[PDB]
Amino acid sequence: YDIQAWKKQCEELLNLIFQCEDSEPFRQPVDLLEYPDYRDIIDTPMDFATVRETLEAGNYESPMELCKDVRLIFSNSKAYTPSKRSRIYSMSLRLSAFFEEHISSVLSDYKSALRFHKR
Numbered sequence: 001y002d003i004q005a006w007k008k009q010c011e012e013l014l015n016l017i018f019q020c021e022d023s024e025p026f027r028q029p030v031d032l033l034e035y036p037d038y039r040d041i042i043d044t045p046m047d048f049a050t051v052r053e054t055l056e057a058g059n060y061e062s063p064m065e066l067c068k069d070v071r072l073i074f075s076n077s078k079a080y081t082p083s084k085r086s087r088i089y090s091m092s093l094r095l096s097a098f099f100e101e102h103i104s105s106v107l108s109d110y111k112s113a114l115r116f117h118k119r
């Protein structure tokens with residue numbers, strides 16, 4: 001029932017994600033120089049460094065907010081991909097499955113802790 005525990009749990013999960021080879025395309029912004037049409041398709045860029053920096057700045061109030069930004073990394077990859085069998089998109093799907101597997105307890109525990117608080 002620790003209302004703050006999600007933050008370190010998310011730091012730990014981001015550490016795991018940064019060690020995963022599948023995260024390499026998503027660790028930093030799109031060199032618009034290598035993908036010049038990227039911002040014609042993607043309205044709101046997002047990367048794992050921005051997520052980690054937002055978390056470390058204390059600019060997430062809840063793990064739901066972090067989860068929304070991580071899911072935006074994956075929806076951007078799905079929107080930008082020319083093919084459902086594009087190398088980078090395929091890496092996004094594996095990393096998304098890994099993230100969802102790990103974030104599910106973080107969200108459950110946070111929401112349970114907040115319910116216990118306002119019991």
Ligand SMILES: Cc1ccc(C(=O)N2CCN(C(=O)NCC3CC3)CC2)o1
Binds near residue numbers: 082
């Ligand atoms: C061909 C294809 C399909 C889907 C995607 C995709 O999701 N992209 C675009 C390319 N990518 C980078 O250029 N990232 C480089 C920074 C990490 C240094 C960002 C993510 O790209």
